[PDB]
RNA sequence: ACGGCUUUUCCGGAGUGUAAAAAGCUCCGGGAAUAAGGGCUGGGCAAGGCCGGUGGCAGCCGCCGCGGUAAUACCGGCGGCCCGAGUGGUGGCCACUAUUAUUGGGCCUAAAGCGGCCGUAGCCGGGCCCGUAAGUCCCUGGCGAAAUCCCACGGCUCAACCGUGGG
């Protein structure tokens, strides 16, 4: 059965970009998927996106631009401290400032660069580069 | 040899003065205790009977030696305070 | 547990017979007149340790990291391996030849107190060289920049006489 | 560079091109090596590389990676064949790899050197290490991977002065491409030299497939082809 | 086979038990922890041992080699067990006699066992009547008491 | 100076050194140059001229 | 082979050193005098296609493999290579090894999916709103002896070692 809406969305996006699709539909929507999409848009990995209302949990329509090498969820959602980001960067990223780790903090969802500037930790939930 | 006085300190509790010095002597052997004592007592106007040389030390690749000596104002205080071995080694008293 | 054991200050090669490394090390040994491989290996290790400290300090941040960062730079310029306006990245361009040029043997030969590297080694071992008024008999001693120019014949040496037969032959070169 | 300039001049004037791209090179409509890539051209004449990149004919810019002898069975005994794997480059940003066959070693060596030129590629270089951020093109700009047969190769950016932390075949290939420092990780049968070399070559080619931003070019000091001071 | 399991955040106990269970499939780990080698070693964990020679023998080399390898039967002082030991060198068997005492050590093959074309022999002679056998075979020294 | 790396008109990715790409002038107007990478040609992706707007293979 | 130089080390002395001695250290007289070994030499793996013996015998061989009268591989001579006051042999642990795999392995044909299915504990679990604050993140009080580890400076000729500060 379905266990993880966010993992399905990111695997779907990475499959679609590899064959040159220009847009995708993320079928079970949720607020967390929306926050992740906002962060992805801020750094230029996707274009415009919009919420579409069924009678169900909603749908997201997303525009792709061919700027994603890879994107995926992080399971389990490891806790991380405010001065410990480097080893996770070496685990998931290809060079010292290449890409973003997406972090859930008690101040919201944000990239690991913004959280490191604020001086806070949180829970890792995704990577994109 | 040329002698330079580095420090003279007063110790009233024991009743003595403590003297640290250097000796410069390129190309010569380490100076003897007798010569150092004679030069020191001339240089400071001391009664030589109450002047004890603690040590003279040479170093690996040096032309100078460092030395430590003590001067008591009273002979009996010297005999009461100082160990027997140092007074014998300095020729102040005779080994039995 | 176990009490402390004193450990070697140098590292050995991971494979004893690699042709290219053997050729490179033979050239260095001939040029600087070193006595054995371990001596050379000692200096190699010193270099490695410097680089390992720079690699760690580049990727660090905080308050103790800065103090360590400036201490590393200060020590490197005191030994004479970097100029006064160098930065941390310059640590990564140091070579093994930079360290060997700081040996007292090399510096005694460079200044013109001996005619050959071998003669400089014998002069050091026999006690004819003074460094800032002190006699030192270790040819591998690394000379600080502040004392480099106060390096002469010992004032009690036979060579401290411009009419000595062996000194005139050294001066003829 | 004085020798190879006149070598290139000598080759050019006595050469009669048999292909369209060879004609473009003969008539002076193409004057730089970088102009033959990224447009789908077929490259079939070795004189093209000899004119545009003459220094691949030097002895220090060629390496014979390995020599094997293989056997075909017949009713009149064993028929022997030589297989030679070789590589060339300019030690700046261009590298090529080839395989040759023949009845004697010299024929195979000649053909292998010839096919390496025709398989030439251009790559990207930079600096991407967490513990060295110097913007000079001494390493790979970011982590890359390649594969062939059972062999998988992963290349990782390294600090300046580290050296090439990789097996010897990889060392030779990376040196010919103009890279000085790297870390690596491998899976599979590295003793199969043909596959090891092809996996490293594929990894070098794959530096062109990563998407990058103008900001990244400044940050990692990315250089395409010649460093060009 | 699906995804490797368990991956969950709160599944530490099961993951640890899985790793412990399949570690017993590694023959290196099992032999060390159960101390199987100690249970059957005639040398009782020692690097060398002393024994007394009972007779001289010869062992044929394995195919496709040909030749006779000279050895001795040795009774160990510490526990009385009897083992076969090789005598290395050209003419070395001539320096050995019955009732002599020898020092033996491992022959140096794979997995701490035998080597070469003589399987079945695990040890070699190093000293004879407290004199190095290598010297005797070369010269430089004489075997005492005749 | 340096040189610019050509970019596919359909998807916008860079063209790699030895792929089976193509480029040609716009069939309708002839004022712009169309580039097509190997992947877009294989999947028959549509393209659009940036000047006259004529589209499609 | 000639000509010259030096004295770390060596031999004999004076001083200092020491509880007393001995080492050590400063000076004086003599003199190149008093001082090189162990392993290896077919491939892995740096180094001989030379000579004399032996002749599937003797022997070598971590592994692959040599030796059957024209042996670069055994024994010896002469050469050569590596390390060097050390250099070889045997046994153990780590690495090699992603051959124990969280990071990070496999299960159609190579070792390996229970003959099939139902279900208990455990692990894993769909979207929205409000509350809580156990997990989780940030700040700050009290603790986790010294020695041991890293850095700078200072004392033994430098170092090893030892001290003062930072971690
Ligand atoms: Mg205990
Ligand atoms: Mg037939
Ligand atoms: Mg394939
Ligand atoms: Mg394998
Ligand atoms: Mg060789
Ligand atoms: Mg052996
Ligand atoms: Mg012969
Ligand atoms: Mg021989
Ligand atoms: Mg496996
Ligand atoms: Mg089944
Ligand atoms: Mg069930
Ligand atoms: Mg939920
Ligand atoms: Mg709390
Ligand atoms: Mg403590
Ligand atoms: Mg000092
Ligand atoms: Mg110090
Ligand atoms: Mg201390
Ligand atoms: Zn760099
Ligand atoms: Zn395209
Ligand atoms: Zn148009």
From Swiss-Prot, chain A:
**A matching Pfam family:** Ribosomal_S8
Q: Which domain of life is it from?
A: Archaea
Complex formation? Part of the 30S ribosomal subunit.
Gene Ontology CC terms? ribonucleoprotein complex; ribosome
Gene Ontology MF term list: rRNA binding; structural constituent of ribosome
In the record, biological process GO terms are: translation
The protein's job, in short, is: One of the primary rRNA binding proteins, it binds directly to 16S rRNA central domain where it helps coordinate assembly of the platform of the 30S subunit.
Q: What's in the keyword line of the UniProt record?
A: Ribonucleoprotein, Ribosomal protein, RNA-binding, rRNA-binding
Q: Record's SUPFAM superfamilies? A: Ribosomal protein S8
Q: Name the chain's protein.
A: Small ribosomal subunit protein uS8
The family annotation for this protein states: Belongs to the universal ribosomal protein uS8 family.
From Swiss-Prot, chain B:
- Classification via SUPFAM superfamilies: Ribosomal proteins S24e, L23 and L15e
Which GO biological process categories is it annotated with? translation
Q: Which InterPro entries match?
A: Nucleotide-bd_a/b_plait_sf, Ribosomal_eS24, Ribosomal_eS24_CS, Ribosomal_uL23/eL15/eS24_sf
Pfam families under this entry?
Answer: Ribosomal_S24e (PF01282)
Per the record, GO CC terms? ribonucleoprotein complex; ribosome
Instruction: Identify the domain of life.
Output: Archaea
One function term, GO molecular function aspect: structural constituent of ribosome
Keywords attached to this Swiss-Prot or TrEMBL record, sorted alphabetically, are:
Ribonucleoprotein, Ribosomal protein
Q: Which family does it belong to?
A: Belongs to the eukaryotic ribosomal protein eS24 family.
What HAMAP family does the record point to?
A: Ribosomal_eS24
User: What is this protein's record name?
Assistant: Small ribosomal subunit protein eS24
Source organism of the structure: Pyrococcus abyssi (strain GE5 / Orsay)
Curated annotation (Swiss-Prot), chain D:
Keywords attached to this entry: Ribonucleoprotein, Ribosomal protein, RNA-binding, rRNA-binding
A Pfam entry, by short name: Ribosomal_S5_C
What Gene Ontology cellular-component terms does the record carry? Answer: cytosolic small ribosomal subunit
Stored Gene3D superfamilies: 3.30.160.20, 3.30.230.10
Which residues belong to the signal peptide in this entry? Answer: none
Q: Per the UniProt entry, what are the Gene Ontology biological process annotations, in alphabetical order?
A: translation
Which residues are in the S5 DRBM domain?
60-123
Domain remarks in the entry? The N-terminal domain interacts with the head of the 30S subunit; the C-terminal domain interacts with the body and contacts protein S4. The interaction surface between S4 and S5 is involved in control of translational fidelity.
Q: How does it assemble?
A: Part of the 30S ribosomal subunit. Contacts protein S4.
Checking PANTHER family in the record gives: 40S RIBOSOMAL PROTEIN S2, RIBOSOMAL S SUBUNIT
Q: Which family does it belong to?
A: Belongs to the universal ribosomal protein uS5 family.
Name of the molecule in the record: Small ribosomal subunit protein uS5
Swiss-Prot record, chain E:
Q: Which gene encodes it?
A: rps12
Where does the source fall among the domains of life?
Answer: Archaea
One GO cellular component from the entry? small ribosomal subunit
Tell me the protein's name: Small ribosomal subunit protein uS12
* Species of provenance: Pyrococcus abyssi (strain GE5 / Orsay)
Mind telling me which Pfam families this protein's record contains?
Answer: Ribosom_S12_S23
Q: List the disulfide bonds.
A: none
Q: List the Gene3D superfamilies hit by this protein, alphabetically.
A: Nucleic acid-binding proteins (2.40.50.140)
**Family annotation (SUPFAM superfamilies):** Nucleic acid-binding proteins
Report the coiled-coil segments.
Answer: none
What are the alphabetically sorted keywords of the record? Ribonucleoprotein, Ribosomal protein, RNA-binding, rRNA-binding
InterPro entries on file: NA-bd_OB-fold, Ribosomal_uS12, Ribosomal_uS12_arc, Ribosomal_uS12_euk/arc
Keyword Lipid biosynthesis included in the entry's annotation: no
Q: Outline the subunit composition.
A: Part of the 30S ribosomal subunit.
Q: Which GO terms describe its molecular function?
A: rRNA binding; structural constituent of ribosome
Q: What is the lineage of its organism?
A: Archaea, Methanobacteriati, Methanobacteriota, Thermococci, Thermococcales
BP terms from Gene Ontology: translation
| UniProt cross-references to NCBIfam families, sorted A to Z | PRK04211.1, uS12_E_A
Function of the molecule: With S4 and S5 plays an important role in translational accuracy. Located at the interface of the 30S and 50S subunits.
The family this protein is said to belong to? Belongs to the universal ribosomal protein uS12 family.
């Amino acid at each position: 059965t379905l266990l993880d809406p966010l993992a399905n969305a990111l695997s779907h996006i990475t499959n679609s970009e590899r064959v040159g699709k220009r847009e995708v539909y993320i079928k079970p929507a949720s607020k967390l998927i929306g926050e992740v999409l906002r962060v992805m848009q801020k750094y230029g990995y996707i274009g415009e996106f919009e919420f579409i209302d069924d009678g169900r949990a909603g749908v997201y329509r997303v525009q792709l631009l061919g700027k994603i090498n890879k994107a995926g969820a992080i399971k389990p959602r490891f806790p991380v401290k405010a001065r410990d980001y480097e080893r996770w960067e070496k685990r998931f990223l290809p060079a010292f400032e290449f890409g973003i780790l997406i972090v859930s903090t008690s101040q919201g969802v944000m990239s690991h660069k913004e959280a490191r500037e604020k001086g806070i930790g949180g829970r890792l939930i995704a990577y994109v580069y | 040899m040329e002698i330079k006085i580095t420090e003279v300190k007063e110790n009233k509790l024991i009743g003595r003065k403590e003297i640290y010095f250097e000796i410069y002597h390129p190309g010569e052997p380490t100076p003897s205790r007798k010569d150092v004592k004679g030069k020191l007592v001339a240089m400071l106007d001391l009664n030589p009977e109450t002047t004890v040389i603690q040590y003279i030390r040479s170093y690996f690749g040096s032309y100078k030696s460092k030395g430590y000596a003590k001067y008591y104002y009273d002979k009996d205080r010297m005999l009461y305070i100082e160990p027997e071995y140092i007074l014998i080694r300095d020729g102040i008293i005779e080994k039995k | 547990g176990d009490p402390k054991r004193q450990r070697k200050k140098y590292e050995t090669p991971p494979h004893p017979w690699i042709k290219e490394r053997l050729d490179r090390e033979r050239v260095l040994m001939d040029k600087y007149e070193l006595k054995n491989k371990k001596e050379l290996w000692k200096h190699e290790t010193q270099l490695k340790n410097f680089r390992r400290r720079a690699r760690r300090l580049l990727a660090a941040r905080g308050k103790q990291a800065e103090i360590e960062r400036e201490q590393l730079l200060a020590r490197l310029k005191r030994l004479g391996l970097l100029p006064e306006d160098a930065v941390l990245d310059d640590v990564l361009s140091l070579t093994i030849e930079d360290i060997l040029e700081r040996r007292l043997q090399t510096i005694v030969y460079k200044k013109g107190l001996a005619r050959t590297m071998r003669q400089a080694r014998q002069l050091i071992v026999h006690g004819h060289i003074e460094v800032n008024g002190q006699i030192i008999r270790s040819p591998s001693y690394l000379v600080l920049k502040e004392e480099e120019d106060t390096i002469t014949y010992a004032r009690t040496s036979p060579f401290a006489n411009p009419q000595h037969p062996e000194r005139m032959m050294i001066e003829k070169a | 560079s004085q020798e190879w300039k006149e070598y290139a001049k000598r080759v050019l004037d006595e050469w009669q091109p048999k292909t369209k791209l060879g004609m473009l090179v003969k008539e002076g409509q193409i004057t730089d090596i970088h102009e033959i890539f990224r447009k789908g051209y077929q490259i079939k004449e070795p004189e093209i590389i000899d004119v545009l990149l003459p220094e691949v004919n030097a002895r220090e810019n060629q390496e014979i990676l390995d020599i094997a002898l293989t056997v075909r069975m017949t009713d009149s005994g064993r028929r022997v064949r030589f297989r030679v794997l070789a590589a060339v480059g300019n030690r700046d940003g261009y590298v090529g790899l080839g395989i040759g066959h023949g009845r004697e070693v010299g024929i195979a060596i000649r053909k292998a050197i010839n096919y390496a030129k025709l398989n030439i590629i251009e790559i990207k270089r930079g600096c991407g290490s967490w513990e060295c951020r110097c913007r000079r093109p001494h390493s790979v700009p970011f982590t890359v991977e390649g594969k062939e047969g059972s062999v998988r190769v992963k290349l990782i950016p390294g600090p300046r002065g580290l050296g090439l932390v990789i097996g010897d075949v990889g060392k030779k290939i990376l040196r010919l491409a103009g890279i000085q420092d790297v870390w690596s990780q491998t899976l599979g049968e590295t003793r199969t030299t043909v596959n090891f070399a092809k996996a490293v070559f594929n990894a070098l080619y794959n530096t062109n497939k990563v998407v990058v931003t103008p900001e990244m070019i400044e940050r990692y000091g990315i250089v395409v082809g010649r460093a060009m001071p | 086979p699906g995804k490797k399991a368990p991956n969950g955040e709160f599944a530490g106990r099961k993951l640890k038990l899985k790793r412990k269970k399949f570690r017993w499939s590694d023959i290196r780990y099992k032999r060390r922890v159960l101390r199987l080698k100690e249970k059957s070693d005639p040398l009782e964990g020692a690097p060398q041992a002393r024994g007394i020679v009972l007779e001289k023998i010869a062992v044929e080399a394995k195919q496709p080699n040909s030749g006779m390898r000279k050895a001795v039967r040795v009774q160990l002082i510490k526990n009385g067990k009897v083992v076969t030991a090789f005598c290395p060198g050209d003419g070395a068997i001539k320096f050995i006699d019955e009732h002599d005492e020898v020092i033996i050590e491992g022959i140096g093959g794979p997995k701490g066992g035998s080597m070469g074309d003589i399987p079945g022999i695990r040890y070699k002679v190093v000293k004879v009547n407290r004199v190095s056998l290598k010297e005797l075979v070369k010269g430089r020294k004489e075997k005492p008491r005749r | 100076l340096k040189f610019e790396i050509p970019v596919c008109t359909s998807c916008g990715r860079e063209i790699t050194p030895r792929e089976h790409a193509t480029h040609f002038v716009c069939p309708n107007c002839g004022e712009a140059i169309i580039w097509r990478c190997e992947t877009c040609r294989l999947l028959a992706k549509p393209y659009k001229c940036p000047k006259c707007g004529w589209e499609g293979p």
